Design an enzyme around this catalytic site. Structure first.
Site, mmCIF file in Angstrom:
data_model
loop_
_atom_site.group_PDB
_atom_site.id
_atom_site.type_symbol
_atom_site.label_atom_id
_atom_site.label_comp_id
_atom_site.label_asym_id
_atom_site.label_seq_id
_atom_site.Cartn_x
_atom_site.Cartn_y
_atom_site.Cartn_z
ATOM 1 N N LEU A 129 9.994 72.382 -75.387
ATOM 2 C CA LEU A 129 11.290 72.063 -74.796
ATOM 3 C C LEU A 129 12.356 73.030 -75.297
ATOM 4 C CD1 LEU A 129 11.380 68.328 -75.938
ATOM 5 C CD2 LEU A 129 9.942 69.290 -74.133
ATOM 6 N N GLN A 176 17.899 74.169 -84.529
ATOM 7 C CA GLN A 176 17.922 72.743 -84.219
ATOM 8 C C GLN A 176 19.200 72.089 -84.730
ATOM 9 O OE1 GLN A 176 14.327 70.669 -83.079
ATOM 10 N NE2 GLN A 176 15.574 72.088 -81.897
ATOM 11 N N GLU A 191 16.297 65.772 -84.385
ATOM 12 C CA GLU A 191 17.455 64.964 -84.029
ATOM 13 C C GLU A 191 18.512 64.992 -85.133
ATOM 14 O OE1 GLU A 191 14.333 61.826 -83.689
ATOM 15 O OE2 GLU A 191 15.695 61.087 -82.120
HETATM 16 N N1 MTE Z 1 16.134 73.044 -77.293
HETATM 17 C C1 MTE Z 1 15.841 71.737 -77.428
HETATM 18 N N2 MTE Z 1 15.841 71.213 -78.681
HETATM 19 C C2 MTE Z 1 15.554 69.910 -78.895
HETATM 20 C C3 MTE Z 1 15.247 69.065 -77.722
HETATM 21 C C4 MTE Z 1 15.267 69.709 -76.404
HETATM 22 O O1 MTE Z 1 15.006 69.024 -75.401
HETATM 23 N N3 MTE Z 1 15.564 71.016 -76.324
HETATM 24 N N4 MTE Z 1 14.962 67.762 -77.862
HETATM 25 C C5 MTE Z 1 15.361 67.133 -79.103
HETATM 26 C C6 MTE Z 1 14.705 65.793 -79.288
HETATM 27 S S1 MTE Z 1 15.402 64.414 -78.608
HETATM 28 C C7 MTE Z 1 13.586 65.678 -80.001
HETATM 29 S S2 MTE Z 1 12.783 64.198 -80.106
HETATM 30 C C8 MTE Z 1 13.027 66.849 -80.750
HETATM 31 C C9 MTE Z 1 11.513 66.843 -80.635
HETATM 32 O O2 MTE Z 1 11.089 67.644 -81.718
HETATM 33 P P1 MTE Z 1 9.536 67.911 -81.976
HETATM 34 O O3 MTE Z 1 9.018 68.101 -80.566
HETATM 35 O O4 MTE Z 1 9.531 69.152 -82.851
HETATM 36 O O5 MTE Z 1 9.092 66.649 -82.685
HETATM 37 O O6 MTE Z 1 13.554 68.095 -80.281
HETATM 38 C C10 MTE Z 1 14.979 68.038 -80.274
HETATM 39 N N5 MTE Z 1 15.555 69.365 -80.127
#
Ligand code: MTE
Ligand code: FAD
Ligand code: MTE
Ligand code: MOS
Ligand code: FES
Ligand code: FES
Ligand code: NA
Ligand code: NA
EC number: 1.2.3.1
Lengths: 1253, 443, 49
Positions: free
Chosen positions: B200, B356, B423
């Site tokens: 993502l 992040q 998060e």
């Molecule tokens: N660029 C990006 N960062 C993101 C997200 C995303 O959708 N895009 N989702 C967030 C959310 S809600 C979650 S749960 C985590 C998931 O992290 P993981 O897949 O490394 O556990 O990415 C976070 N950082």
């Protein structure tokens, strides 16, 4: 005008931009995207593209339904007609039709590529006769070809439509003829004004006038323009002629006229050949037999000319104007004083259709309106004769037309076909002569000798006279019958037109839902019949996807001085021309794209990638390149021996002492046999699509192959990218038989690089004529033997020497000769036996694997000794069961460990061999100009690669939380039903119903580092892998089936997940231990053996050389088959390939090694009427074979060798002929036989176009 | 739909020195017209709202009240930025009533020793992040300049704020943690990885390659990853709860290990050979190069009736100090500086994680200062699009933005002692909120 | 721009594009649903309910 309007499957198609060159078949698949109907050639020979066309005749009020070949049907000729394809009569998405059902559940289907055409050849027949006889079933099928099944399960399913077990006949749906699609009423109104229709293409304009005035007008204004109705000629001849203007006389009524009045029958040009049949039968049946002499001659010729499809479109006019040198109707039309009614824009006229109307005679500006053929005078007789490689659906080697008018001869006339470049004094000398033969034989012999390509002159002249005789007696009979040895009377009786499969059942206690041993239908069987099975080419074209065509070497051995493609690149819609300098990395010990020189007459030199295959075909033909021949040139093996040109060293196998045993032997025998090669003839020509996923160099490849892994590396090594970048998929293959193992890996690479520079998906599909040239087939084989035998038949010593023509690159050659040597001993213990073999390489296309892989080639030589020795001694089966294995013994490579005898014994019974041989002997005492023969051959085959790691195999089985299972393994479905079996397995070990289990495709994403699907071990090895995956999983659900031991498979898996038990598991099989040491000449290679035997029987026509296969019995040790219906199919099929190799199938080359026979029109595989009309197959009572999974035994290649029973069946006929009055070469064809039987006629002339390789 | 709006009802019994003795806090959230992940949100917001503070006597209730609005679902932070914000609204409220400084009231009620959450689960380098943040930001020096500024300025005011944070990660049931992989080794030495997570933009795919590189000890370049597909890894779980690479990291590790152990004899007969020669010989010697990995998951369980359980495998500790200047006349404001310390503990990819935090911080920022959704009385969505819905642009984020991970520290539970920071950053945005809140007060 | 996201995939021959009509009311019974104009509109192949 301009709008093309026709109906597809009741849906209205209206094409505003019609192109006079596109044919129906392209239109269906590439524009409407009904991929159901497929092309396997294009010559109109295989019916694989059969559809049904319906026509309304407003003047008659009739709705006609006839079958046709869509590859030759110009869409521009469909205006106002309707078309129904396979997905029109039924589909699993709605409901399937009885025809689609009975063919699939009856196992009339393996690879599935030839099925839509069968379905549609049968459906059609129903639409016409809902309760058809067999003569009609045979007519509708005469024109479909199949390479897998043998035709038995198909015919049988058709037969189900009129008035142990492999399937349940009682669950079939019943036929409701009133339930079919209703001829579109739009089309009916449309058929009730008259005005010219004209369609314009890129290069061609189609004009179809509506009146004779306008037709005559266009002809005079456009005398070059061809007049096209059938297109069964222009279709072929055109392919590289292109006409700026084409005319369709279809709409002209004066060309469809039949007036029978008074003194002659008058037939309009446009009448098809079906229409001429039906009209000529109606007329002959209401007239006396003295007046109908020539109508019954045409009738006699019409009945075997091509198939139904072609007769349904081919026109009387077209047939006559094109005057083919081997036309069957012309030679009689012209000897009957027939008349052509022609009309130009100047006026009416009549020109005769005489012996020289067939010059090297209509003026350019006149059209044939009809032909007048007169009733026969009371005292005249006419007669037709014919000889062909197969009883129907193939041109005459030589045909004849003859007539006389008296018993003193008042008039005489004879027209031949198949010798002069056209249909060609000796009869003029015979006027006034009493009914003179021996005289006319010498005359006709010198005559035809005076009056080309094709070769085999000797045989062609021998038939020419042979028909003289036939005519001699044919008429003497009517003469005695109007106011004569029996041994003679026979020759006038021609041969017309042509089982129980048995196995042991499954254990009483075995639950229904455990499918092992159960004759389960091929899981894709129904989809094969509905046209839903997506093969490779059936995939949609992606935006930007390009089509590939390649130009190949027209020279055997040559330097490439100049390569200019400038015209190409500029040609319409070409995007790029790819050559050897475009390969980013490795180019091949054999090269994808020729560099500097070319070493074989089919090598690809470059490829052009257009926006349409047609644009790529017609561009590649305008690439120019000049050669400088490189003498020395090697073609024949007899050449490659002189020039000591080989591949790998000599390989030798010995047991006992052959040099000493030779002296203590009573008799010695020396000689040699040659064996012909053979073309795979998978119905799906080689096909691949390369599709860049547009990123990190990644790419999907959907390829028709026996080995996806090989392909994978062959591409990653060509482009210089890691294996991990290219994911290689294969859901199914429309046939293989070995020819898709090496080759597609290469052809995929050729296209891979085109995708590099163009930067886009490339679709690479070979037309058949190229496929036969580029990819090669089975290795021809010359045998040199010395047999020291005793007076009672027991063979004491054999020094046998094999060579095989490998072609211009190694490929799998060396492994072939290794194998042919290991297995040639067969079922016989020759106590002292030396055998050597080397692969002599030549400037021919590169030969590769073929069902049997060397065994049908090498075994055939040793069998040629058993019958040779039996001959010198003066009975075959006696000499055979003297030298056959008895106790536990050892092969020539020292491996050990026999229910071979059982198969033999059982075969000797089930066939009633001794009773029938009696009838045969008697027959031979009654018959002279005709003879029969019977033969029973034993067989000890074996299976598997010669090294342990070659046996490994893998699987990845997946269980989702709803209870459904997804299987995936290393094997590839080629129609022999691996996929089906792996589901049967998965069903045992997971103890869920097959229906819970599903299998998508084979892919290098799911099972890495796989081995080709070959050596008949496919399901043995993968069977083990998939078994291993299931077991591992079950063991993981152990605790889950304890806490709820009586629950449902569904509840189990859900709980597995909730309790963190992994439902993703992979299986693996290290392989069977196998090793060989060629230096010590000994080792254990094969895990087990396959034992079998066959008894066949035939009747040869001493006068023409032709023969029919009467009965054939086969016993084969299957030992607890995993799928009785699948295996039996394998045997039946592989038997027919075997049959074709030894009796029908011919490849021919010119002195410089160019391939003459390129296609179905010239390459004859067995059709429905060639296989023994009484064909029985039975597996020996099940017996332990604990090595293989579930005590099964791979029967993939088994049946092939057993074909030579028909060979040796023939061989004994010949002998019995010659006796009342050797070592036969592999293809024992009409030629070879006719000559073998020498008589008063074969003594007239003695003796190039073709050189046996 | 999106994040669940949240109404907070609270009663705070506090002492005169700022120490909070009791809190009866009541949460409701608008879930919309269908369940979706709602109920799990309110469960989570309640579990985590206590944050970094030990309120010795604390009652908290929450229910998901459903309405005729589009169905709301998960959002980075999943209930914590919503519920935490209410408890922070007490610390500054109490600090107000006392006239005591905010950070004073905050480090009075912050955890000290080993302690327990409101669900009875049980060390702490939370303080470290706070301390380090108090330094790296020079909090006390700058607050001085701010105070002075407020004495010089009337129609304009500044504010500074530093907020602690104890976040955590992971689903509330063991089986929710499982994960799988299928690693493939072709005979040319190239490896194809495939797992259950989904890229993502937070760089799972990248990490799984880093992992595969350790355990196969080949260079990342030998290794390649195509996509996530249900053909290659069945029965997977959503990529969420910030555990993506923890769980899959373990699956992919498992696949590699299993394989290596299979090449054991191959790296002995030729101990000094090349990875390429090894695999070719593996194949020739019938050793399978197709292997699948699996992770049963972290043990986690909760019993809402007893109100106690151990859910999260570990905790993420952090803190942020932000500073702003509001324009009393228009209401506008600019974000001047922001500092963030966050316990990452041996990050698997410093560049990925830092990203992040930086990002998630801004989403946090927008939630508390810029982003608005508005509805008409009958619940129709007014703000449909970018023209009306304002996310942070380049000129909104604090022009001086510093981020730093605390010195690495053992977290042996997770692979390679890493810690999911997906998060984390979000809640720390309310530092800009409370930065603003203090400006207003001073006004 | 070489990263293929979902929408970046080529359109296949016959591939269709989807649009949906949504409730303009918060809470309501659906008395009548007529789409007859739609089905007839240009290049529409089907309306799904
Ligand atoms: N660029 C990006 N960062 C993101 C997200 C995303 O959708 N895009 N989702 C967030 C959310 S809600 C979650 S749960 C985590 C998931 O992290 P993981 O897949 O490394 O556990 O990415 C976070 N950082
Ligand atoms: C698979 C196959 C097997 C076959 N086997 C045999 C066989 O065993 N024996 C045998 O004898 N033949 C055989 N044939 C030949 C077949 O009979 C001919 O193709 C057919 O008779 C020609 O008809 P047509 O309408 O297709 O010709 P077309 O291709 O339509 O054209 C024939 C030529 O004649 C001209 N022409 C057509 N109609 C008229 C008209 N009304 N007036 C003036 N000129 C006209 C056209 O300009 C054209 O140049 C076979 C053909 C095929 C495809
Ligand atoms: N219908 C069909 N039969 C066939 C083939 C095929 O491609 N299609 N291939 C033949 C060859 S050469 C082999 S090696 C075996 C392969 O099947 P197996 O994998 O079960 O041995 O099927 C044989 N019979
Ligand atoms: O080994 Mo099968 O391809 S002759
Ligand atoms: S495709 Fe038409 S007959 Fe071969
Ligand atoms: S089934 Fe007829 S060709 Fe394979
Ligand atoms: Na070869
Ligand atoms: Na909700």
């Amino acid at each position: 005008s301009d709008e093309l309007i026709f109906f597809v499957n009741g849906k209205k198609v209206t094409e505003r931009n019609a192109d006079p060159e596109v044919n129906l078949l392209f239109y269906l698949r590439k524009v409407i995207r009904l991929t159901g109907t497929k092309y396997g050639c294009g010559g109109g020979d295989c019916g694989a593209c059969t559809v049904m066309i319906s026509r309304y005749d407003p003047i008659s009020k009739r709705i006609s339904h006839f079958s046709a070949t869509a590859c030759l049907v110009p869409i521009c000729s469909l205006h106002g007609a309707a078309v129904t394809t396979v997905e029109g009569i039924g589909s699993t998405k709605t409901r399937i039709h009885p025809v689609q059902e009975r063919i699939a559940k009856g196992h009339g289907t393996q690879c599935g590529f030839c099925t839509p055409g069968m379905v549609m050849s049968i459906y059609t027949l129903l639409r016409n006769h809902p309760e058809p006889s067999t003569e009609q079933i045979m007519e509708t099928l005469g024109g479909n070809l199949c390479r897998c099944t043998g035709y038995r399960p198909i015919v049988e399913s058709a037969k189900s439509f009129c008035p142990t077990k492999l399937y349940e006949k009682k669950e079939f749906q019943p036929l409701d003829p009133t339930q079919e699609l209703i001829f579109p009423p739009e089309l009916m109104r449309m058929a009730e004004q008259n005005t010219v229709l004209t369609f314009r293409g890129e290069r061609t304009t189609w004009i179809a006038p509506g009146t004779l005035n306008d037709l005559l007008e266009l002809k005079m204004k456009h005398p070059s323009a061809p007049l096209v109705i059938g297109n069964t000629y222009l279709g072929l001849h055109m392919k590289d002629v292109s006409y700026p203007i084409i005319i369709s006389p279809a709409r002209i009524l004066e060309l469809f006229v039949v007036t029978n009045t008074k003194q002659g029958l008058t037939l309009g040009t446009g009448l098809s050949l079906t229409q001429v049949k039906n009209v000529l039968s109606d007329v002959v049946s209401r007239l006396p037999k003295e007046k109908t002499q020539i109508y019954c001659a045409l009738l006699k010729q019409l009945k075997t000319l091509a198939g139904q499809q072609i007769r349904n479109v081919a026109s009387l006019g077209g047939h006559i104007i094109s005057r083919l040198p081997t036309s069957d109707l012309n030679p009689i039309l012209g000897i009957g004083n027939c008349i052509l009614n022609v009309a130009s824009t100047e006026g009416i006229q009549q020109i005769p259709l005489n012996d020289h109307f067939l010059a090297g005679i209509l003026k350019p500006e006149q059209v044939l309106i009809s032909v007048f053929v007169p009733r026969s005078s009371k005292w005249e007789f006419v007669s037709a004769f014919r000889q062909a490689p197969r009883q129907q659906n193939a041109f005459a080697t030589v045909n004849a037309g003859m007539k006389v008018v008296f018993n003193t001869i008042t008039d005489l006339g004879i027209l031949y076909g198949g010798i002069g470049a056209t249909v060609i004094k000796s009869c003029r000398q015979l006027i006034g002569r009493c009914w003179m033969l021996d005289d006319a034989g010498k005359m006709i012999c010198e005559e035809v000798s005076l009056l080309a390509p094709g070769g085999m002159e000797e045989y062609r002249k021998t038939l020419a006279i042979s028909f003289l005789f036939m005519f001699y007696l044919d008429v003497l009979k009517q003469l005695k019958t109007r106011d004569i040895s029996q041994k003679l009377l026979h020759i006038l009786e021609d041969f017309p037109l042509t089982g129980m499969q048995s196995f042991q059942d499954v254990d009483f206690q075995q639950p229904l839902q455990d499918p092992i041993g159960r004759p389960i239908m091929h899981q894709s069987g129904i989809k094969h019949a509905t046209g839903e099975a997506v093969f490779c080419d059936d995939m949609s074209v992606l935006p930007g996807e390009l089509f590939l065509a390649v130009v190949t070497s027209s020279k055997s051995h040559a330097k490439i001085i100049s390569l200019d493609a400038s015209e190409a690149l500029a040609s319409l819609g070409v995007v790029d021309v790819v050559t050897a300098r475009d390969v980013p990395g490795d180019n091949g010990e054999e090269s994808l794209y020729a560099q500097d020189e070319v070493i074989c007459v089919g090598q690809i030199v470059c490829a052009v990638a257009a926006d349409s295959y047609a644009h790529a075909q017609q561009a590649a033909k305008k690439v120019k390149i000049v050669y400088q021949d490189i003498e020395p040139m090697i073609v024949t093996v007899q050449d490659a021996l002189q020039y000591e040109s080989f591949i790998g060293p000599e390989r030798k196998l010995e047991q006992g002492n052959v040099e000493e045993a030779f002296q203590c032997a009573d008799q010695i025998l020396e000689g040699e046999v040659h064996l012909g090669g053979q073309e795979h003839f998978y119905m799906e020509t080689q096909s691949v699509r390369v599709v860049p996923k547009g990123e990190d160099k990644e790419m999907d490849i959907y390829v028709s192959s026996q080995d996806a892994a090989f392909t994978q590396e062959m591409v990653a090594r060509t482009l210089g990218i890691p294996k991990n970048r290219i994911n290689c998929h294969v859901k199914r293959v429309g046939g293989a038989f070995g020819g898709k193992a090496s080759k597609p890996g290469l052809l995929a690479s050729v296209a891979a690089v085109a995708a590099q520079k163009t930067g886009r998906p490339i679709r690479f599909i070979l037309e058949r004529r190229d496929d036969m040239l580029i990819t090669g087939g089975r290795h021809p084989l010359l045998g040199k033997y010395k047999i020291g035998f005793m007076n009672n038949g027991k063979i004491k010593a054999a020094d046998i020497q094999l060579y095989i023509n490998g072609g211009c690159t190694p490929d799998d050659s060396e492994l072939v000769i290794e194998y042919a040597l290991l297995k040639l001993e067969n079922a016989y213990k020759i106590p002292n036996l030396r055998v050597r073999g080397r692969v002599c390489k030549t400037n021919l296309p590169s030969n590769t694997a073929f069902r049997g892989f060397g065994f049908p080639q090498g075994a055939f030589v040793t069998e040629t000794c058993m019958s040779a020795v039996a001959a010198k001694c003066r009975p075959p089966e006696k000499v055979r069961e003297l030298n056959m294995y008895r106790t536990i013994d050892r092969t020539i490579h020292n491996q050990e460990f026999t229910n071979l005898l059982q198969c033999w014994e059982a075969c000797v019974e089930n066939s009633s061999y001794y009773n029938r041989k009696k009838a045969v002997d008697e027959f031979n005492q009654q018959r002279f100009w005709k003879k029969r023969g019977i033969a029973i051959i034993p067989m000890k085959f074996s299976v598997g690669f010669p090294k342990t790691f070659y046996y490994q195999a893998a699987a990845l089985v997946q269980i989702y939380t709803d209870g459904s299972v997804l299987v995936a393994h290393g094997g590839v479905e080629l129609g022999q039903g691996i996929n089906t079996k792996m589901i049967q397995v998965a069903s045992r070990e997971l103890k869920i119903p097959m229906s819970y289990i599903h299998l998508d495709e084979m892919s290098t994403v799911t099972v890495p580092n796989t081995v080709t699907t070959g050596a008949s071990t496919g399901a043995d090895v993968n069977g083990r892998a998939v078994q291993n995956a299931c077991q591992i999983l079950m063991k993981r659900l152990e605790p889950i089936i304890k806490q709820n031991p009586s629950g449902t498979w569904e509840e189990w898996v859900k709980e597995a997940f909730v309790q963190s038990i992994s439902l993703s598991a992979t299986g693996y099989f290290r392989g069977y231990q196998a090793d060989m040491d060629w230096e010590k000449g000994e080792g254990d290679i094969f895990p087990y053996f396959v034992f079998g035997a066959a008894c066949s029987e035939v009747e040869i026509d001493c006068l023409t050389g032709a023969h029919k296969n009467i009965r054939t019995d086969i016993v084969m040790d299957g030992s607890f088959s995993i799928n009785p219906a699948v295996d039996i199919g394998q045997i039946e099929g592989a038997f027919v390939q075997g049959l074709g190799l030894y009796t029908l199938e011919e490849l021919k080359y010119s002195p410089e090694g160019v391939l003459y026979t390129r296609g179905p029109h010239q390459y004859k595989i067995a059709s429905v009427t060639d296989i023994p009309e009484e064909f029985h197959v039975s597996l020996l009572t099940p017996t332990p074979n604990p090595k293989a999974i579930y005590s099964s035994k791979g029967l993939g290649e088994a049946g092939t060798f057993l074909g030579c029973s028909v060979f040796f069946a023939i061989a004994a006929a010949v002998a019995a002929a010659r006796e009342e009055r050797w070592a036969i070469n592999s293809p024992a064809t009409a030629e070879v036989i006719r000559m073998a039987c020498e008589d008063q006629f074969t003594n007239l002339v003695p003796q190039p176009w073709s050189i046996p390789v | 739909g999106g994040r669940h709006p949240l109404l907070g009802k609270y009663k705070i019994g506090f002492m005169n020195n700022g120490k909070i003795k009791a809190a009866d806090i009541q949460l409701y959230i608008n879930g919309g017209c269908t369940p979706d992940d709602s109920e799990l949100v309110i469960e989570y917001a309640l579990l985590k709202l206590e944050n970094a503070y030990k309120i010795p006597n604390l009652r908290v209730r929450g229910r998901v009240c459903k309405t005729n609005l589009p169905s709301n679902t998960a959002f980075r932070g999943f209930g914590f930025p919503q519920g935490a914000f209410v408890t922070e609204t007490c610390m500054s409220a109490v600090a107000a009533k006392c006239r005591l400084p905010p950070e004073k009231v905050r480090e009075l009620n912050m955890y000290r020793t080993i302690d327990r959450t409101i669900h009875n689960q049980e060390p702490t380098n939370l303080l470290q992040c706070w301390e380090a943040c108090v330094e790296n930001s020079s909090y006390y020096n700058r607050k001085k300049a701010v105070d002075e500024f407020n004495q010089q300025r009337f129609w304009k005011k500044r504010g500074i704020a530093i907020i602690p944070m104890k976040f955590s990660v992971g689903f509330p049931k063991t089986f929710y943690y499982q994960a799988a992989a299928l690693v493939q080794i072709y005979t040319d030495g190239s490896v194809l990885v495939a797992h259950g997570g989904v890229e993502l933009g937070q760089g799972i795919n990248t990490k799984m390659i880093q992992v595969a590189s350790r355990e196969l000890k080949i260079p990342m370049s030998y290794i390649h990853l195509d996509e996530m597909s249900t053909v290659t890894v069945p029965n997977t779980v959503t990529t969420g709860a910030s555990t993506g690479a923890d769980v899959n990291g373990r699956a992919v590790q498992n696949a590699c290990q299993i394989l290596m152990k299979r090449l054991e004899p191959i790296i002995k007969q030729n101990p000094s050979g090349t990875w390429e020669e090894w695999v070719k010989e593996a194949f020739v010697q019938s050793i399978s190069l197709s292997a699948t990995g699996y992770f049963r998951g972290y043990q986690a369980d909760m019993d809402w009736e007893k109100g106690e359980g151990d859910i999260f495998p570990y905790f993420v500790f952090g803190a942020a100090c932000s500073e702003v200047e509001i324009d009393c006349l228009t209401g506008a404001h600019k974000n001047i500086r922001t500092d963030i310390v966050m316990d990452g503990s041996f990050s698997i990819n410093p560049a990925v994680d830092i990203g992040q935090i930086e990002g998630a911080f801004v989403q946090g920022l927008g939630l508390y200062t810029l982003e608005e959704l508005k509805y008409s009385p009958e619940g129709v969505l007014y703000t449909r699009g970018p023209h009306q819905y304002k996310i942070a642009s380049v000129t909104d984020i604090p022009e001086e933005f510093h981020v730093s991970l605390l010195t690495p520290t053992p977290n042996p539970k997770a692979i390679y002692s890493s810690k999911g920071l997906g998060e984390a950053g979000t809640f720390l945005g309310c530092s800009v909120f409370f930065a603003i809140a203090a400006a207003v007060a001073a006004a």
